[PDB]
Amino acid sequence: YLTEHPDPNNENIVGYNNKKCWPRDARMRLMKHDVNLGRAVFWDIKNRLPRSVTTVQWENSFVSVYSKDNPNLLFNMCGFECRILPKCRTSYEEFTHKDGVWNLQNEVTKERTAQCFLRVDDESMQRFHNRVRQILMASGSTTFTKIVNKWNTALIGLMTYFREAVVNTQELLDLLVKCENKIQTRIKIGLNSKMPSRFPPVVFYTPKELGGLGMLSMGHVLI
């Protein structure tokens, strides 16, 4: 790779895509050797595909290297954000049961060898936020029941797809509560032009068949 595309300034670190969502010591560590290896692997793969049929851009791709310097292996798949950490490598610690941590264990000797930490893709979080924004704008003259039905369907889909990742992602919980508050405020503004103080939650959370809106909750609401 370096004979093909010589790099005298070690410029190979400028454009290296990284997973910002993880902490600094969990992200990839842009060491010289690992950076060069990742770029070389991407170059080798790109060479095989003719550019008349299809392309493989670097900006939209991501190549993660696990080696003597990097102890984590990262990848994004199907909207999840997975980071695999070996037990032998930079763990040195006992582990209790957290929601978002899968305990990957060897299949023949049945021994805990690695842990996979899950998070929700920033793209998926933005998609959910935009869906909520669409609900709010398109509400217009629509009914409170229909608004709450849309919110319920969106929340159910998100929470049944990203089951543990939602609990593991701290940003997603804050986003969820902010969006739920937005929906509640929309209903209240529809009720009256002046926002109230200490609005009762029974109206929102009473089941539909019992006269209420049957709103689903994913926050800490104290009655």
Binding site: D99, V167, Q170, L173, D174, V177, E180, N181, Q184, S197, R198, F199, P200, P201, S217, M218, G219, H220, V221, L222
Partner: peptide, 14 residues
Amino acid sequence: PTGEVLSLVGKLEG
């Protein structure tokens, strides 16, 4: 005790 909904963060211990 306002009717606002609060983030679960830090309230999943139990």
